[PDB]
Structures are given as structure tokens and as C-alpha cells.
RNA sequence: AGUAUGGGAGAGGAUGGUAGAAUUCCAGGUGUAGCGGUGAAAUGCGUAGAGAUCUGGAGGAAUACCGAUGGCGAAGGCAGCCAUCUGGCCUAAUACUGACGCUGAGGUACGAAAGCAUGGGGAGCAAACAGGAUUAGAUACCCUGGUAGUCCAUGCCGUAAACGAUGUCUACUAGCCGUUGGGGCCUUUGAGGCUUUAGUGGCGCAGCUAACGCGAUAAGUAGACCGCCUGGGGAGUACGGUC
């Protein structure tokens, strides 16, 4: 219905899963994909392959909205960030910027205890 | 050094807005302490950003 | 960061440049440190060992 | 009798009243005791980060010397004034009168 | 606190000679003035132990000087403690 | 050994205010099938809409970068910024007092964390506890939740591998390389180089040591005073007493 030419891609990468969300500016969502949705159940969610396939799914869905240039923001550690941004370019989008925006506390709340494995 | 010398203050700030260690610029310790104090005062006065 | 793009900059080269910028910023190191809580005793021991290693490196590079 | 340096941020919508604010402040300080050793107006500067969704403000600097009661009442007025969104007060040694940088 | 004029007043009053700033009378008077002055501070800041240590140091120094003066000359000791109001 | 006058550095202490990042919760906009978690899973959350993303509120606790084998403090300890009150230390030259000193049985003051009492507060974390896993069994290590507590005001308790496993004070005894706060001198225009002093580190001669090692910050050469030891267990235990 709505036509948008430029948008933002948010990548939430962790040690367990990666989420790719396509939004317009001002922060309204358009489409989103995840490793769990494209199979890769369980431990497989963290592999770069799942990240790349999820990114391709998200880009293909956004092309229906019909935008070409997007800005990429990466938040979180974990593999598949570079794979995800590469896949977004591979769908033929023009990336306008790519930034690292993981939040950092100024010595705030106490973290959980260390694991004795 | 005072908090009004914004140009010299930015001379010792990275692009993220963080203070540069004295190892990188060869500054003396006494000057570095005053520099950090002035940088924090300027941040509070909002002449320079906290982050970015 | 904010890795903006030239007209001729390829996606792969842009991503490599962005990786270099993130590694220079060292945000992931702070993210890793924030994950688990470290006792002040452990922090002091780690810093003492790091200082010893740095002084040994300086002595080795001087002589 | 101590020396202080004061920085005040004023809402630009109330920059037309800054003359009244400064005149009454300096008049009170003077009729109590002490002198004003510098008055400076940097103008309507842009902010590095917004405060209360405000992106620009008027900067006034005062280098004064006064007493404890005067300092208390200045704190009182600065706190319960509304055009003043931020202030900084710093104890100083020696009197500063020279044209400071960035004042222009 | 005490100022230069305040200290000079006590020094001039209790001095035993010209430029006499080292006499036991002068030292005890200065310590007494400082101790009486700090009582106001320690009423409002009862949990300031780090400064109370310095206060006890002042008290002990005053006691040692008084004992030395009493050993040297009894009349000067009595006159000084009478003038300063100390009970011993 | 101490006093007066000028100058200097500091997360030294107490009181009050204030700033920014982040976690949690709440309301709302976009938007739709998963999210979360592990070695692998499961418990758990979600189609009365989660997670993701954007805006706006509430509250508590802690202060990234600077940051350092750095600094301050008797020790325990002390880190955002500002003001008020306040202790000690370093440094120059004169002036002043004239042994006023050192140590210290009893005594007294301070003294991490946990804990206790009365009243508040409660984001995050988390003894006890509940559930899910692993295992021959699991009462644990792992996962999801979670109360006291951690925070504040006023008191108590008086213990730690409270450690440099090294009581306090004084004098003397090759050198080499760092660093912090001052003083002086010399270059010659501004940044360097020599000295001296009080701290804080790395090697090392003599000497010492069972050896490891210490070595001007002695565990060397001597002096003053105090505390403590006398095979391993029973035992820092029993009885008596003080708190």
C-alpha cells in the first residue's frame, strides 16, 4: 500500500540468534525475518548461514514495499553480522551507511554471576 | 587549561567522544588531569557531546 | 563509526572498512566485559599481571 | 570575601528578558556587597545535545565576588527561576577580568 | 576557622619577647584557640573520624607542652593556665 | 623535637545538590510468528499480539573513556561534576623555643564482608526455596524463577590469607635503569640536560640465609622498647570469668 524509497535495517545479533528487521525512517516496521523462522532450529540459529538466509528473506520481503537504498545499523556481538550485511547487498540494495550502535553502560547495573562450567 | 578552549579540547577527543589516553599523545600527567576535568565540565555545559 | 559510502565503493569493501572501524573502536571488548560480573580482587590481579607484562615488553624493546 | 565564576543557560524564547535578569542579579549583588569583575554574553548558541527538547540557548558568563549569603540567595533565585535551564558555579582564586576566549 | 589577624592577636598577647613564636605559652594558646574553634565543627559533623584524629593530636601536643612548662617553671605554668582557663 | 610567615599536589573525611549512558516496569505507534536458553535440551514467555523497532513517563543503584608497576589515608579503605565545613603531607629561607625525645604492660579510639535492632526503600543481582535438565544416585556444578540481603537514617557486633604471611624509632654500608610531588643549576627561547629532596618500582657487589631468596623500601652492620614461640594431635576446645 504505502511506497517508501529509503529505509533502515536493524540487525540484532547475539550468541544464540540473529534477527533482521526492515523499517522505514521514524521507526515503523515493514518486514522482519529470523533464523528460527527459516528452520535452523536449536543450536543452528547462530551459524552465519542462517543469518544470510534470513537477511535474504527480509530483503526480498522489503522489495515488495519497493525501496532501494537502506541504512544499516548493527547492534550486538555474535557471528553473522557481516554475513547479514553482505546478503543485504547481494539482494541488490544500495547501502548508504553502516554503523555500530551496541549500548554501553557508564558503570550501571550489576551483571549476572560468572558460570562455572 | 580551561573549559572554554573548545578547539584544544577537541584536539584530545576521539570521534566517539572519548578521552584519548596520555600514552597516545605523550601528555604529562598533571596536564592530563586538568584536561580530563575541563572535558567533563564542557560535557556538562553541553559545549561538546557526551557520546558521538 | 557511521561508515558512509562513496559512489564507487563496493559492498564488500564497505563491510571490511566497517569491520576495521569497529575493531578500532573496540566496542565488542566492552560488551564482552559487561557480560559477567568480575570480582574486584580478580580485576586487581588482572591489572597487576597486565602491568608486569607491559613493563617486561618495554624492557625487552629497549634492550 | 570569595571569587566565583558563573555560567547560565537561558531559554531563547526568554532571551528578550535577559537584560532584566542580569540587571536585577547584579543590582542585588552590588547593594549587598562586592563587585562584578566580568559580564559576558556569548549569544544564542546551539547545543551539542538537547535539554528538555531544546536545541539552542543563550549563554551568560559572570565573574563576581561576594559573600555566603549572596551565594545562597543566588542559588535560590537560579533554582526557582524557569528561564534558567542550567547553571555552573566555580570557586576561583584571584580576580579574572580579561576578555575570555570564545566570547568574541 | 581562624585567620592571620586572629593568630597574630594571640601571638602578640602571649609573646614572651620580640618575634617570639616558639615559646610554650604561645604554642599552648594557639592550640587552645584551635581546639575551641573545632568544637563547632564536630557538633554538626559527629561522624567525621578522620578529622577527630587531628584534633586528638592537638590535644596531646598541648598536654606535653604544659607538662614541660610545669617542669621548667611553676609560676609561669600557673599564670598561663589561669589566663587560658584550663582546668589542669 | 616543635612554632610563625609564602607556595604546591592529592579517588583524605562529613553534609547537600546535580548531570549522562544503561537494565527493569508502564502507556502508546509500526508490525507478525516465534522468542529465550544450552554441550544438546527442557522448564518459561507469545496469536486477549511476544520478541524487534520508535516516542513518552516512573523508580532504584552504580559512575565507561581519562586510568597508570599512578595518587591520598595509621590501618580498614577512598573514583562522575559543583558548593559548604574540615584533617594530614610536601617545599624555600629566615626568625623563635631550647632536649620539650623514643617505646609503651594495663587502658582507650578506629576497624572489610557477613550478621543483629528500630524505621524507610527496593531497579539489577541473589543465600534459602520451587521447577527443568545431567547422573547409577545429584541433595551440586548448567537453565528458568525467586525471599532475606545488598541501598538509606540511628545503634550494636569487633572478626578476615585484617598479608609485605616482614612491630615501632635511629645511624651507617658499591653501583645501574624507571616513575610521582617539589627546590636549584645549565643551556638558549623552549624544549631539553645535570643535580638535591620526600614517595613508589625493576636488577645487582659485599654481607646474610637450610635453601628459596633479601639486598639504602635489608631478611646487611649496630642501639632503645614492646609482643610472641618451645614436637604433632586433643585444642583456640572444656570449666571459671568479662563483654
UniProtKB/Swiss-Prot annotation, chain D:
One of its GO terms (cellular component) is cytosolic small ribosomal subunit. GO terms for biological process: translation. The keyword Cell membrane does not apply. It comes from the Bacteria. The keyword RNA-binding applies. Keywords: Ribonucleoprotein, Ribosomal protein, RNA-binding, rRNA-binding. GO terms for molecular function: small ribosomal subunit rRNA binding; structural constituent of ribosome. Belongs to the bacterial ribosomal protein bS6 family. Binds together with bS18 to 16S ribosomal RNA. This is Small ribosomal subunit protein bS6. The lineage of its organism: Bacteria, Pseudomonadati, Pseudomonadota, Gammaproteobacteria, Moraxellales. The gene is rpsF.
UniProtKB/Swiss-Prot annotation, chain E:
GO terms for cellular component: cytosolic small ribosomal subunit. Pfam families: Ribosomal_S15 (PF00312). The keyword rRNA-binding applies. The keyword RNA-binding applies. Keywords: Ribonucleoprotein, Ribosomal protein, RNA-binding, rRNA-binding. Gene3D superfamilies: 6.10.250.3130, S15/NS1, RNA-binding (1.10.287.10). InterPro entries: Ribosomal_uS15, Ribosomal_uS15_bac-type, uS15_NS1_RNA-bd_sf. Signal peptide: none annotated. GO terms for biological process: translation. GO terms for molecular function: rRNA binding; structural constituent of ribosome. Belongs to the universal ribosomal protein uS15 family. One of the primary rRNA binding proteins, it binds directly to 16S rRNA where it helps nucleate assembly of the platform of the 30S subunit by binding and bridging several RNA helices of the 16S rRNA. PANTHER family: RIBOSOMAL PROTEIN S15, BACTERIAL AND ORGANELLAR, SMALL RIBOSOMAL SUBUNIT PROTEIN US15M. Part of the 30S ribosomal subunit. Forms a bridge to the 50S subunit in the 70S ribosome, contacting the 23S rRNA. NCBIfam families: S15_bact. This is Small ribosomal subunit protein uS15. It comes from Acinetobacter baumannii (strain AB0057). The gene is rpsO.
Amino acid at each position: 500500500t504505502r511506497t517508501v524509497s529509503e529505509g533502515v535495517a536493524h540487525i540484532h545479533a547475539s550468541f544464540n540468534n540473529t534477527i533482521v528487521t526492515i523499517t522505514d525512517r521514524q521507526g515503523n516496521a515493514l518486514a522482519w525475518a529470523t533464523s528460527g523462522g527459516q528452520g535452523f532450529r536449536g543450536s543452528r540459529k547462530s551459524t552465519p548461514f542462517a543469518a544470510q538466509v534470513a537477511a535474504e528473506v527480509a530483503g526480498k520481503a522489503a522489495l515488495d514495499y519497493g525501496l532501494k537504498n537502506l541504512d544499516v545499523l548493527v547492534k550486538g556481538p555474535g557471528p553473522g553480522r557481516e554475513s547479514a550485511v553482505r546478503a543485504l547487498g547481494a539482494v541488490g540494495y544500495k547501502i548508504n551507511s553502516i554503523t555500530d550502535v551496541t549500548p554501553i553502560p557508564h558503570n550501571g547495573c550489576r551483571p549476572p554471576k560468572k558460570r562455572r562450567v | 587549561i580551561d573549559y572554554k578552549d573548545i578547539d584544544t579540547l577537541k584536539q584530545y577527543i576521539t570521534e566517539n567522544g572519548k578521552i584519548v589516553p596520555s600514552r597516545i599523545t605523550g601528555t604529562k600527567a598533571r596536564y592530563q588531569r586538568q584536561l580530563a576535568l575541563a572535558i567533563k565540565q564542557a560535557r556538562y555545559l553541553s559545549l561538546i557531546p557526551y557520546t558521538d | 563509526p557511521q561508515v558512509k559510502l562513496k559512489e564507487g565503493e563496493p559492498v564488500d569493501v564497505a563491510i571490511r572498512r566497517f569491520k576495521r572501524s569497529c575493531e578500532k573502536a573496540g566496542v565488542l571488548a566492552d560488551v564482552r566485559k559487561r557480560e559477567f560480573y568480575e570480582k574486584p580482587t580478580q580485576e586487581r590481579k588482572r591489572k597487576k599481571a597486565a602491568a608486569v607484562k607491559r613493563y617486561q615488553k618495554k624492557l625487552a624493546r629497549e634492550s | 570575601m570569595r571569587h566565583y565564576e558563573i555560567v547560565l543557560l537561558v531559554h531563547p524564547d526568554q532571551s528578550d528578558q535577559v537584560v532584566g535578569m542580569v540587571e536585577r542579579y547584579i543590582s542585588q549583588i552590588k547593594e549587598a556587597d562586592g563587585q562584578i569583575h566580568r559580564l559576558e554574553d556569548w549569544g544564542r548558541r546551539q547545543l551539542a545535545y538537547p535539554i528538555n527538547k531544546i536545541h539552542k540557548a543563550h549563554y551568560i558568563l559572570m565573574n563576581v565576588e561576594c559573600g555566603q549569603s549572596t551565594l545562597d540567595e543566588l542559588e535560590e533565585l537560579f533554582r526557582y527561576n524557569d528561564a534558567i535551564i542550567r547553571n555552573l558555579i566555580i570557586r576561583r582564586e584571584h580576580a579574572i577580568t580579561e576578555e575570555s576566549l570564545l566570547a568574541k | 576557622a581562624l585567620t592571620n589577624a586572629d593568630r597574630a592577636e594571640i601571638i602578640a598577647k602571649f609573646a614572651r619577647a620580640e618575634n617570639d613564636t616558639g615559646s610554650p605559652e604561645v604554642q599552648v594558646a594557639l592550640l587552645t584557640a584551635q581546639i575551641n574553634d573545632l568544637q563547632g565543627h564536630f557538633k554538626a559533623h559527629k561522624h567525621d573520624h578522620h578529622s577527630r584524629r587531628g584534633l586528638i593530636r592537638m590535644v596531646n601536643q598541648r598536654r606535653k607542652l604544659l607538662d614541660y612548662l610545669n617542669g621548667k617553671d611553676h609560676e609561669r605554668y600557673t599564670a598561663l593556665i589561669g589566663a587560658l582557663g584550663l582546668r589542669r
